[PDB]
Amino acid sequence: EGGWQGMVDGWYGYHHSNEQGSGYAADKESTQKAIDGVTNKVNSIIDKMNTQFEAVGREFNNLERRIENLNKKMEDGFLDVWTYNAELLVLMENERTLDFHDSNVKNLYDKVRLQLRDNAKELGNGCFEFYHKCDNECMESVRNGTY
Amino acid sequence: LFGAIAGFIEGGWQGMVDGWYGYHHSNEQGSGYAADKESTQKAIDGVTNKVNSIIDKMNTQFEAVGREFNNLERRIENLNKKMEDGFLDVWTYNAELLVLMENERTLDFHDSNVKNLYDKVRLQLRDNAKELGNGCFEFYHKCDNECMESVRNGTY
Amino acid sequence: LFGAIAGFIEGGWQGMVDGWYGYHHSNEQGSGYAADKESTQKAIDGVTNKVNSIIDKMNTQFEAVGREFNNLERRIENLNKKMEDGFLDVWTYNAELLVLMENERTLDFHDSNVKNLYDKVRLQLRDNAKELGNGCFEFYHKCDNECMESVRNGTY
Amino acid sequence: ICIGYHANNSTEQVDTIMEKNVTVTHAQDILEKTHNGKLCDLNGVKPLILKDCSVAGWLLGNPMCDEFIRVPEWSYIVERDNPANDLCYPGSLNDYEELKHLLSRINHFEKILIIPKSSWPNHETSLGVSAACPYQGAPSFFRNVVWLIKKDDAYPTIKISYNNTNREDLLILWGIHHSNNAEEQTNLYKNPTTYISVGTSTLNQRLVPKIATRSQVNGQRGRMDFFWTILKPDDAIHFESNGNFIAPEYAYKIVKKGDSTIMKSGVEYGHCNTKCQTPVGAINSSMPFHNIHPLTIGECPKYVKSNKLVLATGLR
Amino acid sequence: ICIGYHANNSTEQVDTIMEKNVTVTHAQDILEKTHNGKLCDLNGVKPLILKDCSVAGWLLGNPMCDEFIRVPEWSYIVERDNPANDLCYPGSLNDYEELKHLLSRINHFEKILIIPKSSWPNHETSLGVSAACPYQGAPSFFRNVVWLIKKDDAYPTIKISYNNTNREDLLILWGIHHSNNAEEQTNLYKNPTTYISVGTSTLNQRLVPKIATRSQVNGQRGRMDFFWTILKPDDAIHFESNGNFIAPEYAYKIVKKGDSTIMKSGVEYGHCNTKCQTPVGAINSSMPFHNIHPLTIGECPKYVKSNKLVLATGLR
Amino acid sequence: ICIGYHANNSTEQVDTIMEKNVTVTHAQDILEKTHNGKLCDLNGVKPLILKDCSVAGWLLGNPMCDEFIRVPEWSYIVERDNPANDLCYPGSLNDYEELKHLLSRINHFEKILIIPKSSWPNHETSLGVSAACPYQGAPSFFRNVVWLIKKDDAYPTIKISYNNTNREDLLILWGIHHSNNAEEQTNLYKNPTTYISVGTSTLNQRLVPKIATRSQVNGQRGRMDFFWTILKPDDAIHFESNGNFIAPEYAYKIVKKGDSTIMKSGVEYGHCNTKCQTPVGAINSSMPFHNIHPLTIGECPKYVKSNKLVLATGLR
Amino acid sequence: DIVMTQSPLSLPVTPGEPASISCRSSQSLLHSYGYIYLDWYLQKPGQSPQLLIYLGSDRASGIPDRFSGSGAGTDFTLKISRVEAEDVGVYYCMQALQTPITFGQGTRLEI
Amino acid sequence: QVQLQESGPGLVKPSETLSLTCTVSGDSISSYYWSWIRQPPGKGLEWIGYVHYSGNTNYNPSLKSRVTISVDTSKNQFSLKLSSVTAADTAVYYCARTTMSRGPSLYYYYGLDVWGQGTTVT
Ligand SMILES: *[C@@H]1O[C@H](CO[C@@H]2O[C@@H](C)[C@@H](O)[C@@H](O)[C@@H]2O)[C@@H](O[C@@H]2O[C@H](CO)[C@@H](O)[C@H](O)[C@H]2NC(C)=O)[C@H](O)[C@H]1NC(C)=O
Ligand SMILES: *[C@@H]1O[C@H](CO[C@@H]2O[C@@H](C)[C@@H](O)[C@@H](O)[C@@H]2O)[C@@H](O[C@@H]2O[C@H](CO)[C@@H](O)[C@H](O)[C@H]2NC(C)=O)[C@H](O)[C@H]1NC(C)=O
Ligand SMILES: *[C@@H]1O[C@H](CO[C@@H]2O[C@@H](C)[C@@H](O)[C@@H](O)[C@@H]2O)[C@@H](O[C@@H]2O[C@H](CO)[C@@H](O)[C@H](O)[C@H]2NC(C)=O)[C@H](O)[C@H]1NC(C)=O
Ligand SMILES: *[C@@H]1O[C@H](CO)[C@@H](O)[C@H](O)[C@H]1NC(C)=O
Ligand SMILES: *[C@@H]1O[C@H](CO)[C@@H](O)[C@H](O)[C@H]1NC(C)=O
Ligand SMILES: *[C@@H]1O[C@H](CO)[C@@H](O)[C@H](O)[C@H]1NC(C)=O
Ligand SMILES: *[C@@H]1O[C@H](CO)[C@@H](O)[C@H](O)[C@H]1NC(C)=O
Ligand SMILES: *[C@@H]1O[C@H](CO)[C@@H](O)[C@H](O)[C@H]1NC(C)=O
Ligand SMILES: *[C@@H]1O[C@H](CO)[C@@H](O)[C@H](O)[C@H]1NC(C)=O
Ligand SMILES: *[C@@H]1O[C@H](CO)[C@@H](O)[C@H](O)[C@H]1NC(C)=O
Ligand SMILES: *[C@@H]1O[C@H](CO)[C@@H](O)[C@H](O)[C@H]1NC(C)=O
Ligand SMILES: *[C@@H]1O[C@H](CO)[C@@H](O)[C@H](O)[C@H]1NC(C)=O
Ligand SMILES: *[C@@H]1O[C@H](CO)[C@@H](O)[C@H](O)[C@H]1NC(C)=O
Ligand SMILES: *[C@@H]1O[C@H](CO)[C@@H](O)[C@H](O)[C@H]1NC(C)=O
Incomplete structure (x- = not known):
């Protein structure tokens, strides 16, 4: 378990610690990609379900009991399978939206070694340090990804 | 997918019965396997809740009802037969697809529980042990059972 | 997503066709693209099984049957057309969601297999050499063609 | 860091x-x-709320359901679960559920007088009243159909043809009265063996009464089986009869046919507009x-x- | 480690x-x-295993199907795919499928003798037998209804009203006989043109025989078209007929109403209990x-x- | 690496x-x-293309549908959405949609002349024509049924039984003519009140004409309501009728029974073969x-x- | 239509004997909705004409049952079965198919 | 119980316009075509015109040039206006209710059911 309550801007971010500052802000790139993916996920979930079954009220007399039961079972069965489909995606894409949301929380602390090799130790809860004694500029380039 | 089960560690280890996701005690003081009860309990809780979910979402499934039709009304009888067959087909599809989509995600969640536990030890030794290729860790300073209990307990 | 499709492997080679993964070679002797036969064949078998399962598990899909109805039977005609349209809608949803989930699970399966053949190399490599981000595993010592081919063998 | x-x-x-x-x-x-919990106006057009009334009672013109003599355009009809005022005289409208199905596609009726009461010179039109259908306590009868009764102790053979000169479909309702007994039949029509022969380009109907003993629902033991048809432009309906004829007087012209439904709910009406509506209450x-x-x-x-x-x- | x-x-x-x-x-x-491979009692209540009998045969009281004169409470009715004993005399039961649908909700009938054989003074009741419905070799006929044959070369006009004084719905069964020729009518009923007028608070039926030549099904060229209805509490049914009347004798009071189904299976009853049942064996x-x-x-x-x-x- | x-x-x-x-x-x-956009052969057998024809017009043998007298085997029937030729004389075909449902399972008919015109000594067989069913300009009539008319101011009773000696089912087609007035009937059928009784092992009908005034469709105000039945092996159909009888001439042996459908489209046919077919085009x-x-x-x-x-x- | 030719000009017949007046037309009297559109009238010596039968054969309101019409197309015939006294008077046939309404020539029906 | 009665003079000059009026009691001029009739001494019945209650008029082609028919629903009356009275136009003029109402849509027919008592003109 981890996370930091101090940050407000962005779903994913960094923490800063150096003599010149300790306040800390987010990645625009990774957070923008995550929000874009989640927005496309929501858009696709609503768009795939626009052709859903729509119940229509049909009336039947006293001597069409079996046809009325046929209509009732058809309507309740389509409603049941669509309830299953909606509950299954808010149960499946939610697990996948916490596993994608954990993949891009692990693809970032390793980024400082996976893209800037042999820089520092991996520590715990995603915390990563720097070996080299350095001021703001290298930190800001690591934030930028230009080093 | 995460490539630990049948991955960097090649084969399973019989004699691990206290719990899944265990350990091999290996020092001059003694030996014998031990179980990581925390990850085991988490895995069993997850799989139990998953099985509960598949049995709950498959409750209120379509229940076919027998109906009869005379020599005429053949098109309505065909409509009933095709409706029942279609609901049976889509529900069979749902069951046979959710078992497969939750057997790959289950067997890769077992793979998850192993790969993020090889990393619970890598970050708990961190160059103080020459981690090799098979998957075990070789201490530079050989921890005794007292010290080696920390990695199972997560204390250090 | 597992990463390294756009991660430490920033770009992509242009060596060989019909092999879905591969190594690339670089030493005093030359270069080339001899694909990892094991991982590529594993992925080909897996995706072939995936396509086979996709086409097999939706072979019992609903087959619409034309039924005509009288002018004084508009309730049952409405029932029939709504039944057929609802079955077509659930099966269209099934196909369009299985091809939107088994396309991201395939893109990330190939991502996992791409990164998996990297950390195997680091696993066999250990401390005698140092890995770079772009894909190159640079060596303090001098590996010839056979000693580098040992890594691709799987018996380094 | x-x-x-x-x-x-x-x-x-x-x-x-x-x-x-x-x-x-x-x-x-x-x-x-x-949900808002009250019926609203779907896109500005208020519903037809048949309060304590049914589709059959509205269409046939029940005396208690006289608030719906003129009905503006509606977005959806609303009916209660068990309306009290529905076929005040005992009987049954044939293909009632099909009529409701067709009505679910219709958004406006323009009621027109197709057969004035002056088109019955040799039959009584003012004595067709029953206590099962009271108005203000006194006896009455359905307003959109005329119960024709003997005049001068006679019932000449009715033969009337109505040709649709309008550009719109006409929903024409008639019926057949099933009498209590033979003596009642000759007391009302002076003809033991009667019929109603209706003819159209598609419809070829004959209706013979069923003189029998039944139970006292609403205090009467006669059954008016009502029937309906839809008449196309440049199509003519031909009624012939010699008794038991519940003749048309008013027929509804289908002047706007879009989308609608017959919603079943006793929920009260709020003076409110909506865009999606539900029987329990509108969804904004x-x-x-x-x-x-x-x-x-x-x-x-x-x-x-x-x-x-x-x-x-x-x-x- | x-x-x-x-x-x-x-x-x-x-x-x-x-x-x-x-x-x-x-x-x-x-x-x-x-599966168990046997039909088991569903929660202890033994099913109604109609052995070689149909729902129509059981309900009308086929002479071969006398095993079910007194039926205790059940949980599901079991029938064979093609029962041999069903409408022993040729004919049909109108709305048989709807009746079987309504028996999918009925867990118990109590048979009540509603109209005795003493309720036919001026008619013959003991000659209503046929060879197509034998019992122990001798001819017989459906036991829950009575074939009314003329008496003293005459058939007085039946007129009987039964009032449902019970507090439960009554399933009432009758029928109409269809003769080969007018000579058969004269030899059975002594009336060339006959009718059966049945009335209820909701029913209005006038049946007329269709005297024609048909094929020899079961050796007989006549056809009994059987009809049914459900009579509510404080409701009465009025039968009138000058001929062809297959009158009621017994009715089936609906005591317990619940959940059931008409299973179609030939599996032997196993003397066993279950919580779920299938047409090929109890699952459990x-x-x-x-x-x-x-x-x-x-x-x-x-x-x-x-x-x-x-x-x-x-x-x- | x-x-x-x-x-x-x-x-x-x-x-x-x-x-x-x-x-x-x-x-x-x-x-x-x-898709090819053309109707194609399905596994070697060409479909039945009813161009400007209908299933009713084909089966009854419309005089404007003459190319279907000796139809060979097919795999699917192709029909236009609004065929020009269907029931040339006005009327109806009872249970038309059920007959089409059964034709969806039939791959071949062989029409057999079951009742030759020599089997009508006492009636006309070459005068039942009309202007609603022209052939080469001159009037004609359906060729698979025979409209019977008085010979010498007389319509004797028509009692004919056809026994199905063949080893296949027979789709037998007949009908009832509905005249305009009593004068028209007395011109055509001398008997004023007429009937058609039809009997089989599993069918019973008693049809009466509806002499009524109707709209003029195709210049004709009479209505021929056609009826169909399927007669099994060793089963006989019995026709009795004293008037208004549109008698059978040709029945249809169901020689081959398999999988088929009624395509309901008007795409042009090209000489091609496929494994799958849709109304708009084939799918290879x-x-x-x-x-x-x-x-x-x-x-x-x-x-x-x-x-x-x-x-x-x-x-x- | 324009000409209605009534065949007897004076029909002699005694009481208790069937009578048969006839009235041909120069055009088929058949409305577009299958209605004959012929009317039989009686004019007694003092009183104005009285409708007997309309639309071919449909009796009027207050007329005895002895009167009955027949025929279709152009040939039409009135029949007086009882021919009791007070039937003396001039009988007319009228066509209402087209706007030029035309009565037939009278037949006195001498007692 | 509808009753029709004629009104007008008997003596007419052989050069000026005739005027008759027919009054209906028991019901108004509401829903039927109303027809004027003329019969000479003996001879046979002949009809001058008929006016719909709305006002639509159809006249005999023989008498088309001189006839004019009117109607007054308020007074429950309708009149005949034979102009240029020739010696042929000396007869007994009856007044009937056609009771047909064969409009564009509604069709039925009951004949000249109600006849007024005729009035002589010379
Ligand atoms: C319904 O009426 C139309 C129109 O009838 C004509 O116009 C009326 C106002 C009235 O004046 C009628 O007498 C006229 O005939 C009928 O259409 C006509 O039908 C006739 C007879 O078959 C034919 O000669 C005309 O050509 C038709 N005219 C048109 C414009 O189509 C129509 O037939 C009537 N409906 C039925 C079912 O008969
Ligand atoms: C069916 O019977 C009920 C019950 O009352 C019966 O009839 C009474 C006349 C008397 O004989 C009682 O002992 C019986 O139990 C009838 O209900 C009565 O109906 C009458 C009119 O017929 C009415 O005046 C009474 O008030 C009613 N009584 C009650 C208690 O409701 C009922 O009418 C019968 N229904 C039929 C024939 O359809
Ligand atoms: C239809 O015909 C069958 C068969 O008739 C017999 O066999 C034919 C090939 C021909 O030779 C006929 O002349 C024969 O009569 C009838 O079946 C017979 O039914 C009677 C009934 O009593 C029975 O005695 C015969 O044994 C039966 N014969 C056979 C061979 O089955 C059948 O009754 C006829 N009518 C019907 C209902 O289809
Ligand atoms: C969360 O709660 C803490 C503790 O009270 C508070 O300091 C912080 O501002 C809160 N954050 C937000 C985003 O509300
Ligand atoms: C994908 O490209 C197609 C073809 O240009 C275009 O129609 C579609 O909108 C694109 N989709 C997205 C999500 O950009
Ligand atoms: C697996 O089988 C081996 C060989 O017989 C045995 O030693 C071992 O205990 C078994 N493991 C189990 C049952 O877990
Ligand atoms: C989850 O919390 C809800 C209340 O928000 C509670 O009703 C439910 O039982 C909880 N589920 C579990 C598995 O504890
Ligand atoms: C077990 O783990 C707990 C929690 O971290 C710790 O307090 C304890 O020391 C551990 N036990 C041993 C023997 O190290
Ligand atoms: C790809 O296409 C280009 C032209 O667009 C061509 O020159 C080149 O050879 C092809 N192959 C590769 C590997 O780029
Ligand atoms: C899997 O095992 C089953 C056991 O029935 C066998 O039929 C099948 O061939 C095996 N192989 C595959 C690929 O399914
Ligand atoms: C290892 O490489 C050698 C090179 O000579 C090759 O012959 C051998 O097949 C490889 N081994 C495996 C198991 O692929
Ligand atoms: C209803 O919805 C409209 C927009 O469609 C919104 O402006 C309005 O405030 C809503 N009213 C209520 C009472 O929710
Ligand atoms: C059904 O299963 C239950 C639970 O194991 C058991 O008690 C019972 O004996 C089983 N058999 C039957 C016939 O119910
Ligand atoms: C259909 O395709 C097959 C190959 O799948 C080919 O052999 C055959 O010729 C094709 N038929 C037509 C009619 O094009």
């Missing part, structure tokens, strides 16, 4: 396949669980789903029986 | 999309693939699914048409 | 739940979405899905209402 992720104080919880209560930073509820929302009632009307969210459809738009 | 994963001797093979026959350590089967399992037959009754697993449905609840 | 992966030149792309139009390396299309393809049309026949892909399915078999 350190690397990590965002956290907050949000108590939003999410269902997942391996964990059924997961405290997430943010979540988007995709299910609307509330734009979420993907709702869980109020299966049947709705208008551009509505989709119905799912679940109680918590929430999508994890956050971590943890 | 080392790290690994559990393994054992189990050859439990599961399936995934990527690979099939994936051996794992532990796996849970969620499909019940076995707690697994979520079963691939045995679509139609079941009781607290059953949900049917899926699959041969292998196993969850990988273990490690590779 | 230079671990990585390749990348081709293809610009094709797939879509996922979080991204769309993702460029890929290799991809497999699983939607065919093309091995794709798992298609989107050409819902209604299909043959070994077909599975319909999906969409325009883009593709499996991301490639790396990126």
